[PDB]
């Protein structure tokens, strides 16, 4: 099961990005879709399922790609994107 079930809703995750500092650079819509919510501190986000945290986002970073890069064992990632997608990033 998810590490943080309360952030399992994509809509709730999107709402967390109201004061996201990097709107143009990495869209909240893509971050929320990829399982991440904004902690509210700097550009630190966390996945609701694996609880993996990512920060120091660079312009044009792709949330799903970074999810797979750093947390390839996440079951939300696997269910959403499939194993082939994860394997290809590695």
């Amino acid at each position: 099961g998810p590490a943080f079930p309360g952030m399992g809703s994509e809509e709730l995750r999107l709402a967390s990005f109201y004061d996201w500092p990097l709107t143009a650079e990495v869209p909240p819509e893509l971050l929320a879709a990829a399982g991440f919510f904004h902690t509210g501190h700097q550009d630190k986000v966390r996945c609701f399922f694996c609880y993996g945290g990512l920060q120091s986002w660079k312009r044009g970073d792709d949330p799903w790609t970074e999810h797979a890069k750093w947390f390839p064992g996440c079951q939300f990632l696997l269910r959403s994107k499939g194993q082939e997608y994860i394997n290809n990033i590695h």
């Binding site: 945290g53 990512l54 920060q55 986002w57 660079k58 750093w70």
Partner: peptide
Amino acid sequence: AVPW
């Protein structure tokens, strides 16, 4: 991005 990087982990924290």
